[PDB]
Design a protein around this ligand. Structure first.
Ligand SMILES: CCCCCCCCCCCCCCCCCC(=O)OC[C@H](COP(=O)([O-])OCC(O)COP(=O)([O-])OC[C@@H](COC(=O)CCCCCCCCCCCCCCCCC)OC(=O)CCCCCCCCCCCCCCCCC)OC(=O)CCCCCCCCCCCCCCCCC
Ligand SMILES: CCCCCCCCCCCCCCCCCC(=O)OC[C@H](COP(=O)([O-])OCC[N+](C)(C)C)OC(=O)CCCCCCCCCCCCCCCCC
Ligand SMILES: CCCCCCCCCCCCCCCCCC(=O)OC[C@H](COP(=O)(O)OCCN)OC(=O)CCCCCCCCCCCCCCCCC
Ligand SMILES: NC(=O)C1=CN([C@@H]2O[C@H](COP(=O)(O)OP(=O)(O)OC[C@H]3O[C@@H](n4cnc5c(N)ncnc54)[C@H](OP(=O)(O)O)[C@@H]3O)[C@@H](O)[C@H]2O)C=CC1
Ligand code: SF4
Ligand code: SF4
Ligand code: SF4
Ligand SMILES: [Zn+2]
Lengths: 380, 114, 143, 290, 94, 143, 178, 206, 96, 38, 43
């Protein structure tokens, strides 16, 4: 039936059974990026395992650290302080912006429009600069940890973030001019990968793939976890469930992120940054080098880390790609017994076959882009 | 003691499922050396199938047999549909490694292999 | 406002050691800008500055033509920048050595070495721990 | 024995085999297998090269980390051979051309260079030296290559009495100058496989009953040149090359053969299919004895 | 200080040298052996003994932080000095 | 970590103690003694020595011998396992490893004919130390 | 609070005016000339490019690059062989082996790092209670063999001696945040 | 307090009431209902109640547990039925979450629920590939994350971390061959668990 | 900022916006490298009295699951929670 | 619907573990001794 | 004596909506321009 294998030669392998130019069967293949994160974590303390989440869904990395942090804090029965919560929200929204830039621009790239990629990855560089100024790493900042945050913000960061938020709007508009009303974009996207709300639900979708079909589900307005309950923002919903609606949703999300960042900056509180419970979060170095108890706690935390009372949780985060979850099982030990990661790309790929019904070979490459398929969160 | 079964009631039905699976394999084998340009001969391939079947002959449990049938069917799928490759199929013969000699002396002389 | 641009350009051209220096610069560093010389390091490199350019091009360096016995007229590496100037060139600071000098400590390298990934003076690893199990040696005379 | 040599391991890439081998002739066609067989069991391998570093990159992945040491040399340059033979227990020589250049005659290649190699080996204090030659090595030979080979074997034995000469026949594999030479376009042949030859050499590298001896590595079967070339064409410029072609293979009598190292012949009727499918766009050959 | 062995190899700050009969010397051929020429065991000896008018003295290495944990040393044994287990410095009671 | 707090309210000066020398096997850093008397009692009762004791009173008090005596018994070496802290340590094992590195096998002695149950703690394939193992019908925590 | 994207507040008008406007949009290719104009505007701006080896990208005093083993002003080492770095290193990249030195001190005989295992996370310099191991600023240390990235006490001490004039300053900058 | 987590009892009440609700509707297929300190509701059941219970929770008007947030397995090799199976479910009409657990072993499969939730089509394949647990009435069930010739179930507790085989390219045969595993640095097993009890509330009796 | 009025007007007309106020290249508006030194606060548990861990441990305030309907040990119909309240269209911008 | 299979249980052919590591081995079941240090 | 990087009295206001301008002219005028050019050319 003109079968073919497409995608490789960047870890995707589709097996496509066509009928002429139409697409009849899409069989994705998985495990080309399966490393064994969920098993390795079982041989590592609750802190030796955090980087793995920065490495999962590697375009945000901090909405990933955040889920693990919230889960371990839910187990420990502690809560981080206001300043940490606000920093964490701010940077989660920044990661949202990064992810949505990534998605829109790689979509337009795999379709053929390539200049937004270069116009926006400069902003991505300018935000990696924040990542580095706060953590020392551009992408994989092991910066958000159970108990709050590692370090405080240097003295010239909020001003820079304000200068950036000033102009990101004009940049989004620069891109929208080219893309949103272009008849060719509308022809490539409109009425593509349509999906109804009930089938989405029963397939296990989350995020833009839900609220582009008229559903109202955002895990920040519902089941909030951080101070998000103290900040205002709108949730854009769609009407037809197509790539164009999802594009517009992601754009308006990039805008609500600026709306949230203005508030986070203006309302940043003072105080500590990590729970002052030195049996969970290490003490400062001066206290470590002058006080006995603080040094003992440092030693134990960095050799045999904090112990977590047994239990189980499922903490969901409204990540840029949807509900990111962690089923975390604990024995009364320094290390976990099981950590299962729920990623949306999983169900999205699962539903790709139905979403590619009555469509050509050149519409599948856009159906994929509309899911923001990263294979780290999938293959794990 | 008493159990709950899987895809069989007794080793007879289990063995006839096994024989159907062997029919399928035996028949398909040459198409593989044709599609993917393997060096080996169909005789070698068929001897290998026989060896991999008799490797699990002592088995008695209908359930332990049904599961092996399931897994062999998975492999046959992966093979008839060209998802495996020359590499995955030649990973059965071990063309690039010497075996642990089955001799107390050949073991003693080199290592602590017991 | 175009003739002023042309004037800025002609001064950018003639702002070097005539045609020879202009060619040298334009062909090693594909750039003919004019900036202020904040300093020069032991190895012959120069470091220029201009605060009206944008962030990332407001500081730069002209490497030496020779470094520890090597014709660096064409071959050039960011590994040539010693630490004190590395820290000002990657904009960790607003202050260069001349005004903010480092801490004079022995056991600090006086001569900087660049990357040696393949040179004959490169790095070869090994174990630093002595022999653990000492064997038995019998005497050199029988019975 | 030095503890750095005790063969600790399980016979694998990341193991130790106690074999420190300086190998000359690795950039070629048989070294490409000798080095693999040496390294995939955990041996240290010094490789001198004269080529450019690009032509020696197919060998960096056939041995574990740190076991391969690539250094440079020049046959005419002595004191570039001490570097390589020193720090070794075994030396292997595989050099040889199928033609003559300006700087290097058959005399040089097969007599003068191996002699210096063995001299430097003895000077250093190594314990094994392996030299490879042709099966038809003989002073009475239309080809002067074989003349030089049979001279160089003696010139070697005169400095390394306990050496090990190995006379295989026309070798066939991938990137070989025999089947590809035939398919580019009175005499019986018994060819042999690089895999078998390399296994034999790497086994002799340890086997204790191989010193001061010779070995004739020949296949299991024999064929008439015409039947063999027709088999080639069915499955599908040098004077000395054509001379070595138009010579039949000896049946060496009672000489320690291939099955005395432990190896077993691999018939050409099994690897021709993999060697020849590249030259595309059948029944076997009747094995005979004269 | 680096002092060479018969084979011609430099010795390290922990007395490591490939025995002249060792095959592992190959890796250094056409190359070098990376060795540090500044031996702490000597650079600290080059330092003088501090003197104090108190039988107990606290050491941190310098800056409060940037040093090491504050440790207290006794100076009742005029026979020898009081050494710090972190920095190596040594004190006396006068 | 379990039953104690997480910070100090002690903003005063600590104390320091003169370190003894009581043999080639036992290293003494006596500013870590928490005055528990396990060593004194072990010696007086099991080893029948009566040469350890407490000289002084108050915080100025400390443990050991009033003189430079050496503590060399057939049982000297269990004070190491019994001292809850690192005031008494083993000079051989000094600085060679840390507990979380060791792999622990359970074996027996051959030095004598008693068969004392023992633990051998290795690291990367080397034997690092030897410990007792409770067998209340043979050795009962001693070796 | 929610919003609508791709939904009109109400039906439109089929007036000749709006129909002709849409027909002009279609025929005259109006919505595309605006994209052409955006590209022209970008052509007439200044690019964000930089001469790399001469102009370097900006970093922070917290950057985590190449490793270094530090010393005290006296010149004495700092590592006391406490193994917290080896115990926290997620990738199990630090191998340590210590002994008592002839001067009776806790110092290492072996300290190896594998840069093909380090994920560059900084936990080792977060744990070091003496500020002896630091993930320095350097990032330009690529190689041609996999055997030049297996570091050791000597290489790391040389890197420390090399980069201390910068590591010390960056630590002076940032040590009040940690 | 500023370092401890707040504690709302309304959710505990609601979820205990719903536990009683569910358990008295399905006295069969039900056992070990429990709501925890952190206000999460688990319902343990018999392997014969999977589809009944999932359908009830999805369709029942009071429940509307539509979204299958996750499907998981968990290996506890000290109990005869060693493979715990976990369904994490979400309802939007109530803004609620629930956990439904069952048990299994080797040779004792579970019933598939692609009829109920189609998301499971891949989660169940993943469970079969990782923990070795068969499902009845699954259209396609095959290796999804592992290689094609992989023989084993690696997310168990007895399967070694580094595995049993290892891959590399060999010039002789010009392929990526598999071989036994020979590492140049054996993974180090750090024994960390402390001898001193940290949580008495979970102290088992002797 | 180093461009002539003609080019500025050309680009502004081609884009429709004003760029010389929302540029993406940074010209001295940014924070100053080499900032002064900070002095961070201290948490609330840095007291010297009334700071016992028994009151503020947390991870020991946990308790095992409160089990119900263990198989070995006319009510109304309830929901796992009161039904979700639907959302309100925004006021700033409810469309596009 | 129930069957009776009283023979000993074995899953060796499903574990995927090989012969070398399933017959050439010796396992130990115990309680780890207390560290006399603590 | 303390300093931990908070914001001052307040940051400026920010724009997060669209500003896509209404450009061009009317279809009637565009068609008239084109047709006038066309008729001039024909004549
Ligand atoms: C190796 C050579 C091989 C031989 C090939 C043949 C040679 C061909 C000649 C090409 C020469 C190009 C080389 C330029 C570098 C020369 C050195 C130099 O002048 O330093 C830059 C120096 C500028 O320094 P700067 O600090 O970066 O300031 C730049 C302006 O702020 C920013 O400038 P701006 O963007 O605001 O524009 C200023 C002005 C600059 O003048 C031009 O660009 C005229 C271009 C020719 C018109 C066609 O252009 C205008 O905007 C006004 C004219 C409008 C033209 C209409 C074009 C369609 C719209 O001086 C110049 O810019 C003059 C260069 C003008 C190009 C002359 C070629 C005509
Ligand atoms: C290195 C130096 C290179 C220098 C290159 C210089 C190139 C100069 C070329 C001219 C530049 C034009 C760029 C576009 C400027 C942006 C215009 C804009 O924003 O408004 C658009 C506006 C935007 O409209 P709008 O969508 O925002 O709103 C109006 C919508 N309607 C009309 C439906 C109500 O659209 C127009 O008005 C289009 C006007 C032109 C229509 C006629 C073009 C089609 C007919 C072609 C005739 C034949 C070709 C004629 C040309 C011959 C020579 C090639
Ligand atoms: C005397 C009175 C009467 C006289 C008779 C004549 C009267 C005038 C008649 C009017 C003539 C109209 C102009 C003729 C061409 C029109 C072609 C056209 O309209 O194409 C339609 C097509 C889109 O169609 P559709 O998909 O249905 O629209 C979306 C529906 N919502 O659009 C397209 O797909 C076009 C795709 C374009 C993609 C590339 C665009 C590049 C543009 C670069 C600029 C080119 C400018 C011209 C260059 C000139 C060359 C020198
Ligand atoms: N195949 C056959 O027909 C038979 C072959 N043999 C023996 O097999 C051995 C190898 O065969 P083959 O692998 O085909 O040889 P190759 O020609 O494939 O490569 C042999 C090596 O010899 C080296 N070499 C040749 N001449 C010189 C020189 N003048 N100076 C330095 N190095 C030189 C080359 O190094 P570089 O590539 O770097 O130049 C080359 O790598 C030969 O010694 C031959 O006697 C024996 C019997 C039968
Ligand atoms: S056993 Fe140790 S802590 Fe106890 S009194 Fe003796 S030296 Fe002090
Ligand atoms: S920075 Fe590298 S070496 Fe240091 S702890 Fe992290 S992974 Fe290990
Ligand atoms: S943490 Fe620091 S002092 Fe301790 S072993 Fe590591 S480098 Fe040495
Ligand atoms: Zn000190």
């Amino acid at each position: 039936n003109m079968t073919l294998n497409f995608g490789p030669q960047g870890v995707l392998r589709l097996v496509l059974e066509l009928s002429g130019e139409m697409v009849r069967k899409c069989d994705p293949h998985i495990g080309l990026l399966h490393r064994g994160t969920e098993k390795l974590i079982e041989y590592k303390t609750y802190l030796q395992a955090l980087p793995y989440f920065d490495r999962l869904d590697y375009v945000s990395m901090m909405c990933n650290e955040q889920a693990y942090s919230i889960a371990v804090e839910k187990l420990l029965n502690i809560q981080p302080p206001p300043r940490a919560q606000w920093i964490r929200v701010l940077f989660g929204e920044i990661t949202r912006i990064l992810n949505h830039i990534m998605a829109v621009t790689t979509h337009a790239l795999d379709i053929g429009a390539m200049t937004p990629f270069f116009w926006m990855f400069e902003e991505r560089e300018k935000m990696f600069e924040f990542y580095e100024r706060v953590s020392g790493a551009r992408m994989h900042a092991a910066y958000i940890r159970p108990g709050g945050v590692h370090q405080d913000l240097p003295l010239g960061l909020l001003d820079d973030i304000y200068e950036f938020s000033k102009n990101f709007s004009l940049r989004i508009d620069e891109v929208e001019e080219m893309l949103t009303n272009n008849r060719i974009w509308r022809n490539r996207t409109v009425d593509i990968g349509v999906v109804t709300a009930e089938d989405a639900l029963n397939y296990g979708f989350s995020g833009v793939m839900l609220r582009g079909s008229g559903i109202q589900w955002d895990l920040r307005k519902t089941q909030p976890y951080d101070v998000y309950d103290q900040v205002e923002f709108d949730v854009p919903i769609g009407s037809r469930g197509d790539c164009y609606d999802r594009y517009l949703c992601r754009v308006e999300e990039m805008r609500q992120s600026l709306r949230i960042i203005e508030q986070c900056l203006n309302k940043m509180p003072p105080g500590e940054i990590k729970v002052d419970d030195a049996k969970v979060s290490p003490p400062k170095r001066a206290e470590m080098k002058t006080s006995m108890e603080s040094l003992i706690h440092h030693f134990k935390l960095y050799t045999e880390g904090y112990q977590v009372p047994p239990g189980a949780t499922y903490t969901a985060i409204e990540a840029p790609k949807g509900e990111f979850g962690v089923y975390l099982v604990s024995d009364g030990s320094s290390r976990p017994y099981r950590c299962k990661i729920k990623a949306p790309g999983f169900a999205h790929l699962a539903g790709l076959d139905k979403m590619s019904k009555g469509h050509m070979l050149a519409d599948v490459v856009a159906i994929i882009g509309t899911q923001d398929i990263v294979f780290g969160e999938i293959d794990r | 003691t008493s159990v709950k079964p899987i895809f069989s009631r007794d080793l007879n039905e289990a063995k006839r499922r096994v024989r159907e699976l062997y029919r399928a394999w035996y028949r398909e084998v040459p198409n593989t050396v044709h599609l993917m340009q393997l060096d080996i001969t169909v005789k070698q391939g068929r001897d290998k199938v026989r060896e991999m079947f008799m490797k699990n002959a002592h088995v008695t449990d209908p359930r332990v047999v049904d599961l092996l049938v399931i897994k062999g069917k998975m492999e046959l799928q992966e093979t008839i549909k060209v998802w495996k490759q020359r590499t995955h199929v030649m990973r059965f013969f071990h063309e690039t490694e010497t075996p642990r000699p089955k001799d107390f002396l050949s073991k003693f002389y080199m290592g602590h292999d017991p | 406002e175009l003739v002023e641009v042309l004037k800025r350009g002609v001064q950018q051209v003639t702002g070097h050691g005539g045609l020879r220096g202009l060619l040298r610069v334009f062909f090693r560093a594909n750039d003919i800008r004019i900036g202020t010389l904040v300093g020069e390091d032991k190895y012959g490199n120069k470091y220029y500055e201009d605060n009206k350019q944008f962030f990332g091009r407001h500081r730069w360096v002209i490497y030496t033509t020779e470094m520890n016995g090597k014709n660096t007229f064409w071959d050039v590496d960011g590994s040539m920048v010693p630490p004190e100037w590395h820290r000002w060139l990657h904009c960790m600071t607003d202050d260069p050595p001349t005004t903010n000098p480092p801490t004079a400590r022995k056991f600090i390298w006086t001569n900087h070495k660049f990357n040696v990934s393949a040179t004959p003076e490169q790095y070869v690893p090994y174990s630093t721990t002595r022999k653990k199990i000492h064997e038995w040696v019998p005497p050199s005379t029988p019975y | 024995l030095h503890h750095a040599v005790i063969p600790h391991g399980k016979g694998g890439r990341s193991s130790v085999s106690g074999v420190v081998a300086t190998v000359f002739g690795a950039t070629g066609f048989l070294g490409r297998y000798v080095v693999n067989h040496l390294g995939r069991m955990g041996s240290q391998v010094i490789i001198p090269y004269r080529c450019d570093v690009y032509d020696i990159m197919h060998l960096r992945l056939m041995g574990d980390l740190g076991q391969l040491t690539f250094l440079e040399w020049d046959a005419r340059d002595k004191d570039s051979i001490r570097k390589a033979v020193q720090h070794s227990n075994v030396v292997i020589n595989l050099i040889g051309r199928e033609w003559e250049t300006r700087n290097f005659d058959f005399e040089d290649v097969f007599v003068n260079i191996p002699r210096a190699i063995a001299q430097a080996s003895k000077e250093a204090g190594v314990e094994r030296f392996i030299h490879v030659s042709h099966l038809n090595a003989s002073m009475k030979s239309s080809s002067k290559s074989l003349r030089s080979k049979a001279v160089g074997e003696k010139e070697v034995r005169s400095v390394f009495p306990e050496a090990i000469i190995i006379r295989p026949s026309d070798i066939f594999g991938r990137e070989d100058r025999f089947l590809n030479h035939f398919a580019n376009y009175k005499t019986v042949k018994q060819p042999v496989y690089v895999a078998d030859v390399s296994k034999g050499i790497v086994n002799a590298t340890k086997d204790p009953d191989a010193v001061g001896k010779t070995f004739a590595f020949t296949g299991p079967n024999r064929y008439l040149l015409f039947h063999l070339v027709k088999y080639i064409f069915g499955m599908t410029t040098t004077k000395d090359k054509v001379e070595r072609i138009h010579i039949s293979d000896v049946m060496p009598t009672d000489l320690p053969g291939l099955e005395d190292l432990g190896v077993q012949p691999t018939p050409l009727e099994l690897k021709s299919i993999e060697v020849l499918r590249r030259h595309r766009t059948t029944k076997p050959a009747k094995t005979v004895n004269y | 200080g680096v002092q060479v062995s018969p084979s011609g190899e430099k010795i390290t700050h922990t007395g490591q040298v490939y025995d002249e009969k060792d095959y592992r010397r190959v890796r250094f051929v056409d190359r070098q052996k990376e060795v540090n020429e500044n031996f702490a065991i000597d650079l600290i000896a080059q330092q003088p003994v501090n003197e104090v008018e108190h039988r107990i003295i606290a050491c941190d290495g310098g800056g409060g932080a940037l040093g090491h944990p504050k440790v207290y040393i006794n100076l009742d044994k005029e026979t020898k000095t009081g050494t710090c287990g972190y920095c190596g410095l040594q004190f006396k009671q006068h | 970590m379990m039953f104690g707090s997480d910070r100090s309210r002690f903003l005063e000066g600590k104390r320091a103690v003169e370190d003894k020398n009581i043999g080639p096997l036992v290293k003494t850093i006596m500013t870590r003694c928490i005055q528990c008397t396990r060593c004194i009692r072990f010696a007086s009762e099991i080893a029948g020595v009566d040469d350890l004791g407490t000289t002084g009173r108050g915080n100025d008090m400390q443990v050991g011998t009033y003189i430079e005596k050496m503590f060399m018994s057939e049982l000297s070496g269990n004070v190491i396992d019994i001292c809850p802290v690192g005031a008494l340590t083993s000079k051989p094992y000094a600085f060679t490893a840390r507990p979380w590195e060791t792999r622990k096998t359970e074996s027996i002695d051959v030095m004598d004919a008693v068969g004392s149950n023992i633990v051998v703690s290795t690291r990367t394939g080397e034997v690092m130390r030897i410990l007792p193992r409770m067998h209340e019908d043979i050795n009962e925590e001693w070796i | 609070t929610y919003k609508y994207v791709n939904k009109k507040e109400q039906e439109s008008e089929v007036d000749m005016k709006s129909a002709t406007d849409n027909a002009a949009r279609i025929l005259m290719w109006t919505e595309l000339i605006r994209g052409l104009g955006m590209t022209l505007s970008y052509l007439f701006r200044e690019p964000a490019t930089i001469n790399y080896p001469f102009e370097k990208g900006p970093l922070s005093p917290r950057f985590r690059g190449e490793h270094a083993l530090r010393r005290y002003p006296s010149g004495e080492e700092r590592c006391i062989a406490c193994k917290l770095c080896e115990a926290i290193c997620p990738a199990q990249a630090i191998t340590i082996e210590a002994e008592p030195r002839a001067d009776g001190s806790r110092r290492t005989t072996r300290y190896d790092i594998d840069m093909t295992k380090c994920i560059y996370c900084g936990f080792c310099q977060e744990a070091c209670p003496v500020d002896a191991i630091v993930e320095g600023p350097n990032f330009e240390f690529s190689t041609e063999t996999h055997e030049e990235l297996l570091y050791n006490k000597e290489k790391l001490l040389n890197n420390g001696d090399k980069w201390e004039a910068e590591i010390a300053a960056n630590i002076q900058a940032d040590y009040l945040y940690r | 307090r500023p370092t401890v987590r707040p504690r709302s009892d309304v959710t505990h009440k609601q979820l205990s009431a719903f536990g009683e609700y569910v358990a008295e509707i399905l006295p069969k297929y039900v056992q070990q209902v429990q709501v925890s300190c952190l206000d999460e509701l688990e319902i343990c059941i018999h392997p014969d109640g999977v589809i009944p219970t999932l359908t009830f929770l999805r369709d029942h008007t009071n429940a509307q547990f539509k979204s299958l947030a996750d499907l998981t397995a968990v290996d506890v090799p000290t109990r005869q039925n060693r493979f715990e199976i976990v369904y994490n479910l979400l309802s939007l009409r109530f803004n609620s979450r629930i956990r439904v657990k069952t048990y299994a072993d080797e040779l004792t499969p579970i019933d598939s629920i692609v009829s109920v939730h189609i998301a499971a089509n891949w989660y169940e394949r993943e469970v079969w590939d990782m923990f070795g647990v068969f499902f009845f009435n699954h259209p396609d069930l095959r290796r999804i994350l592992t290689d094609y010739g992989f023989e084993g179930h690696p997310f168990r507790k007895d399967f070694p971390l580094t595995g049993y085989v290892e891959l590399r390219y060999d010039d002789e045969v010009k392929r990526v061959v598999a071989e036994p595993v020979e590492l140049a640095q054996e993974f180090r097993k750090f024994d960390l668990n402390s001898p001193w009890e940290a949580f008495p509330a979970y102290r088992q009796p002797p | 900022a180093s461009a002539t009025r003609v080019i500025q007007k050309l680009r502004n007309w081609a884009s429709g916006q004003d760029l010389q106020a929302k540029l993406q290249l940074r010209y001295q508006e940014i924070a100053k490298r080499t900032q002064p030194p900070p002095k961070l606060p201290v948490g609330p548990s840095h007291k010297l009295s009334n700071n016992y861990y028994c009151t503020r441990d947390g991870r020991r305030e946990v308790v095992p699951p409160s089990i119900i309907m263990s198989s070995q040990k006319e009510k109304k119909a309830v929901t796992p929670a009161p039904p979700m309240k639907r959302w309100e269209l925004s006021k700033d911008q409810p469309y596009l | 619907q129930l069957i009776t299979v009283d023979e000993k249980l074995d899953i060796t052919t499903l574990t995927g573990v090989p012969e070398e590591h399933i017959k050439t081995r010796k396992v130990r079941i115990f309680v780890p001794a207390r560290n006399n240090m603590q | 004596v303390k300093q931990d990087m908070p914001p001052p009295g307040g940051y400026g206001p920010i724009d997060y909506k669209r500003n896509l301008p209404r450009r061009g002219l009317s279809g009637y005028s565009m068609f008239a321009v084109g047709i006038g050019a066309l008729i001039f050319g024909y004549w």
